[PDB]
Amino acid sequence: NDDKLYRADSRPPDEIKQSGGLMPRGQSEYFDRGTQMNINLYDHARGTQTGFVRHDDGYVSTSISLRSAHLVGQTILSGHSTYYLYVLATAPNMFNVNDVLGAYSPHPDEQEVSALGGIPYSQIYGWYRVHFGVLDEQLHRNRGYRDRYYSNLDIAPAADGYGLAGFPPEHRAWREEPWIHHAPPGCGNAPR
Amino acid sequence: TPQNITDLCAEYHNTQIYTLNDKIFSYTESLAGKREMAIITFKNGAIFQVEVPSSQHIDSQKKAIERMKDTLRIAYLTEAKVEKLCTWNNKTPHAIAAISMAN
Amino acid sequence: TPQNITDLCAEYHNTQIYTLNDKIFSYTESLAGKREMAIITFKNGAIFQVEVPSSQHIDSQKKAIERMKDTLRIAYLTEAKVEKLCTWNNKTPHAIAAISMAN
Amino acid sequence: TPQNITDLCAEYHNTQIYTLNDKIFSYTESLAGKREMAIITFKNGAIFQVEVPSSQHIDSQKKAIERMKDTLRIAYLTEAKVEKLCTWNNKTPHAIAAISMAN
Amino acid sequence: TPQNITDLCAEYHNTQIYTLNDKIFSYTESLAGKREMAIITFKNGAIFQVEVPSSQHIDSQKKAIERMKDTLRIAYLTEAKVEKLCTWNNKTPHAIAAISMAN
Amino acid sequence: TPQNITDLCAEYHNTQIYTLNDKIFSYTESLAGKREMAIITFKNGAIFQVEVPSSQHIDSQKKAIERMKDTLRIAYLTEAKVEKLCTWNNKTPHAIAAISMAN
Amino acid sequence: SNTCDEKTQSLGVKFLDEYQSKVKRQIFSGYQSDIDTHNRIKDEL
Numbered sequence: 001n002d003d004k005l006y007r008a009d010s011r012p013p014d015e016i017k018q019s020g021g022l023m024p025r026g027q028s029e030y031f032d033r034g035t036q037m038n039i040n041l042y043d044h045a046r047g048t049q050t051g052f053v054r055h056d057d058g059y060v061s062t063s064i065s066l067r068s069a070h071l072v073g074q075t076i077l078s079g080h081s082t083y084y085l086y087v088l089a090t091a092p093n094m095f096n097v098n099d100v101l102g103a104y105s106p107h108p109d110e111q112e113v114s115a116l117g118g119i120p121y122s123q124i125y126g127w128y129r130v131h132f133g134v135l136d137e138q139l140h141r142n143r144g145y146r147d148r149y150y151s152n153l154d155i156a157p158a159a160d161g162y163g164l165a166g167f168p169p170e171h172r173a174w175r176e177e178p179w180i181h182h183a184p185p186g187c188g189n190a191p192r
Numbered sequence: 193t194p195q196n197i198t199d200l201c202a203e204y205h206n207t208q209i210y211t212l213n214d215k216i217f218s219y220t221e222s223l224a225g226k227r228e229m230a231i232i233t234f235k236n237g238a239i240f241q242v243e244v245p246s247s248q249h250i251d252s253q254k255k256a257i258e259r260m261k262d263t264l265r266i267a268y269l270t271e272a273k274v275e276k277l278c279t280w281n282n283k284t285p286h287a288i289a290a291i292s293m294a295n
Numbered sequence: 296t297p298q299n300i301t302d303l304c305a306e307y308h309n310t311q312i313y314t315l316n317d318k319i320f321s322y323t324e325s326l327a328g329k330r331e332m333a334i335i336t337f338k339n340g341a342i343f344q345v346e347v348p349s350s351q352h353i354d355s356q357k358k359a360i361e362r363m364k365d366t367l368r369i370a371y372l373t374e375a376k377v378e379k380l381c382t383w384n385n386k387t388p389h390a391i392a393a394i395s396m397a398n
Numbered sequence: 399t400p401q402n403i404t405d406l407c408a409e410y411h412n413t414q415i416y417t418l419n420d421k422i423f424s425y426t427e428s429l430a431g432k433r434e435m436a437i438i439t440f441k442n443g444a445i446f447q448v449e450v451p452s453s454q455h456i457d458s459q460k461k462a463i464e465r466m467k468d469t470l471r472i473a474y475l476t477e478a479k480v481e482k483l484c485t486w487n488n489k490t491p492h493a494i495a496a497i498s499m500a501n
Numbered sequence: 502t503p504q505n506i507t508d509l510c511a512e513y514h515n516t517q518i519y520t521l522n523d524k525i526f527s528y529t530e531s532l533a534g535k536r537e538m539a540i541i542t543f544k545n546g547a548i549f550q551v552e553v554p555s556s557q558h559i560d561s562q563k564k565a566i567e568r569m570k571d572t573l574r575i576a577y578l579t580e581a582k583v584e585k586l587c588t589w590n591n592k593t594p595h596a597i598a599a600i601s602m603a604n
Numbered sequence: 605t606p607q608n609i610t611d612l613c614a615e616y617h618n619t620q621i622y623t624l625n626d627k628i629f630s631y632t633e634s635l636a637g638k639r640e641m642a643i644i645t646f647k648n649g650a651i652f653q654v655e656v657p658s659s660q661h662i663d664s665q666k667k668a669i670e671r672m673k674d675t676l677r678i679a680y681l682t683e684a685k686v687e688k689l690c691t692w693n694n695k696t697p698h699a700i701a702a703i704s705m706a707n
Numbered sequence: 708s709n710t711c712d713e714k715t716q717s718l719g720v721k722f723l724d725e726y727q728s729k730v731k732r733q734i735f736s737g738y739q740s741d742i743d744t745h746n747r748i749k750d751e752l
Contacts, residue, residue: 017580030727031683031727031731033707033720033724033727036716036720038716039715039716039719039720039722039723040715040719058719058723092726093726116719116722116723116726117723117726117727120730120734122730122733122734143580144580146271146733146734146737147271148271148376148398149374149733163718164715164718164719164722166715169708169711169712184711184714184715184717184718185710185711185714186708186709186710186711186713186714187710187711187714187715188711193538193540193550193592193593193594194531194536194540195540195548195593195594196529196540196542196548197529197531200529200531200533200536203533203536204533217397217398218378218395218396218397218398219395219396220299220300220303220393220394220395220396221362221363221366221393221394222303222359222392222393223356223359223360223362223363223391223392223393224303224304224306224307224381224392224393225352225353225355225356226353226355227297227303227306228355228356228358228359229296231298231299231300231303233299239298239299241296242532244355245355249534250534250535252534252535252537252553252554253532253533253534253537255537255567255749256531256532256533256534256537257532258358258748258749259530259532259567259570259571259745260530260532261362262741262744262745263530263574263741264741265366265740265741265744266574266578266737266738266740266741266742266744267578268396269369269373269396269737269740269741270578270737270738270740272578275527278531278533283296284296284298285296285298288532289531289532289533290529290530290531290532290533291529291530292527292528292529293527293528293529293577294526294527294528318501319501320500320501321498321499321500321501322498322499322500323402323403323496323497323498323499324465324466324469324496324497325403325406325462325484325495325496326448326459326462326463326465326466326494326495326496327406327410327459327484327495327496328455328456328458328459329456329458330406330409330496331458331459331461331462331465332399334400334401334402334403336500342401342402344399347458358748361747361748361751362744362747362748364465364747365741365743365744365747366744368469368472368743369472369736369737369739369740369741369743369744371499371501372472372473372476372478372732372736373733373736373737373740374501374733387399388399388401421728423706424687424704424705424706424707425704425705425706426608426609426612426702426703426704426705427671427672427675427702427703428606428612428668428690428701428702429665429668429669429672429700429701429702430612430613430616430619430690430692430701430702431662431664431665432664433605433606433612433615433702434664434665434667434668435605435606437606437607437608437609437612437704439706445607445608447605447607449605450605450664451664460751461751461752464667464671464747464750464751465747465751467671468671468743468746468747471675472736472739472743474705475678475679475682475684475731475735475739476731476732476735476736476739477727477728477731477732477735478732479728489605490605490607491605491607502639502641502653502695502696502697503639504643504651504697505632505643506632506634506643509632509634509636509639512636512638512639513636558637559637561637561640561656561657562635562636562637562640564640564670565634565635565636565640566635567745567749568633568635568673569633569635571742571745572633572677574742575677575681575738575742576681578738579681579738584630587634587636597635598634598635598636599632599633599634599635599636599639600632600633601630601631601632602630602631602632602633602680603629603630604680604683667750670750671746671750674742674746678738678739678742681738682735682738682739
């Protein structure tokens with residue numbers, strides 16, 4: 001569907017185009033197959049937050065509603081008068097952290113949707129400009145944003161994510177449902 | 193030289209310039225013999241044609257009629273958004289004489 | 296002049312539009328002598344062609360067919376939604392004679 | 399007429415079907431006298447060629463080979479998955495006769 | 502041969518170099534016989550054309566004229582980033598004679 | 605025939621193979637009389653050219669150069685990774701003979 | 708152990724790669740869209 005997500009980022013729109021979109025930490029160009037980061041949701045989910053909404057271990061976090069996304073960044077990225085809030089079409093590279101980890105979600109309340117690898121510029125529908133904390137309601141539409149295509153897609157069934165979850169090898173989940181039928185090799189396993 | 197579409201268009205007559213300021217809703221491409229056109233439609237429901245490379249055209253034009261049908265199909269496929277369209281009002285559907293794109 | 300794929304197709308015989316408001320499933324391009332074709336396949340097992348020229352065609356055709364084979368390819372790669380489709384049902388596979396891309 | 403590539407490929411003797419069901423790994427294009435051809439490779443090994451428009455060709459083909467080197471490359475940049483390869487196996491490397499790309 | 506647009510522009514006697522380092526603000530294309538060209542502008546305010554072919558256009562650069570009209574469109578769309586143009590100052594709008602692309 | 609850019613090139617007296625595994629840094633293009641070429645750069649200096657059609661060039665080679673400036677442009681916008689180029693080095697800037705894109 | 712920690716990555720990378728192929732394909736196919744059309748009949752007559 002035509003669902004949009006949110007992410008209060010500081011990095012300029014001009015440096016995003018350059019980048020290919022919004023990247024996790026340690027990725028600079030969106031198309032490096034050989035420029036590998038750690039890809040982990042579990043670790044991702046529980047990084048602490050130095051000066052950025054969660055963007056570690058191969059994913060970039062979104063918020064499902066703005067107010068939310070803005071509450072979360074002028075809580076963080078506070079210190080900067082300037083920042084942007086990017087509106088983001090929904091695609092199947094988006095995991096509902098909660099629907100993935102379930103019990104084991106490091107921060108439910110917080111309800112994040114996460115893009116594995118980052119959000120390609122084309123995904124980014126446009127953005128808000130964040131000045132003197134207070135939001136500026138004027139919308140900067142995004143060339144590069146494909147509407148036919150994106151209003152046609154939604155987020156990936158959680159079960160796509162069960163294999164990716166990333167619990168330590170001897171963690172309980174790997175031997176519980178649903179993980180037990182999705183668990184990568186050497187992951188918890190059959191035995192123990 | 194027309195240093196823009198607005199000039200350009202009025203250079204001619206049997207024309208009129210429409211500010212469409214929008215992306216293209218649909219695209220039809222014919223192959224029917226004696227019906228070899230492109231047809232652009234708008235949300236507002238504004239129909240247009242790229243003339244069957246018909247006998248009323250200067251050789252130079254022939255090459256032009258084709259490229260156009262090409263600007264259409266990639267502006268469409270790319271949700272590019274036209275600004276204005278200079279068009280001939282003497283035809284139904286009002287044939288396309290030129291196109292601009294900005295923003 | 297015809298104003299949409301519907302009234303267009305209607306001038307010709309052994310035709311019938313087909314709604315699809317879909318996209319392409321297969322793309323098949325041959326080069327083998329006697330076979331410079333493209334066969335289109337819809338997810339609901341529907342098969343269509345783009346025929347090899349002239350016999351029943353006009354030279355004004357021959358460039359059309361060449362635009363069609365064009366369109367579909369990147370009608371496919373892109374992911375389409377070939378709205379409707381005019382076709383010579385008097386054929387088999389049924390010969391594509393026009394195409395309509397709808398948002 | 400075949401409705402698929404498999405039905406097409408046996409209408410020719412000295413052909414062969416290849417399910418690769420994957421994306422091209424690398425693409426080479428040559429413009430060095432007599433070696434004006436294209437060269438395609440698969441992860442698994444398979445190298446395939448679009449042949450130099452020599453005399454094994456009818457005139458109908460010449461321009462279907464240019465559309466074919468275009469298709470590889472578009473499909474090479476694009477990363478589409480080739481699912482099937484119709485090829486003449488009496489050459490070396492194998493020689494592309496047709497390509498199937500279903501989603 | 503010259504390894505620049507700068508040294509390349511230099512080979513001519515009524516040309517100048519343009520360091521824009523921006524993306525085409527607009528793009529227009531007429532198909533209208535006696536004006537089959539293209540003008541493109543920059544937000545700075547800059548204008549340029551792609552001349553309607555001949556007599557001064559040796560037979561060779563016709564193919565070249567056309568190349569660059571395709572280069573002007575795809576740069577617009579794809580979000581450009583042209584470094585410099587090499588324009589002829591005999592005209593207003595200055596005509597384009599070459600281009601650099603830096604990314 | 606040849607089955608790779610190495611073997612391909614190694615089949616001539618005056619050509620060399622450049623290994624780049626890099627992407628085109630700048631894309632220069634000319635429509636200018638006499639100089640209707642394309643120059644491609646590299647960040648760690650590589651400069652190459654796509655020569656003008658001439659003697660040294662047959663009929664077969666003429667399409668091939670045209671469909672190689674098509675392939676640099678998009679290799680450039682597409683941001684593609686260039687593997688190995690086979691260059692005729694009796695020239696300056698070296699002229700491209702062969703391109704191989706991999707990854 | 709190594710296998711599990713390793714295996715997730717094998718998996719994560721794999722996932723990221725195929726997705727990159729749909730984006731590229733859609734952004735890439737589109738640009739070459741009617742460019743690749745000027746490429747055809749103007750190109751073979």
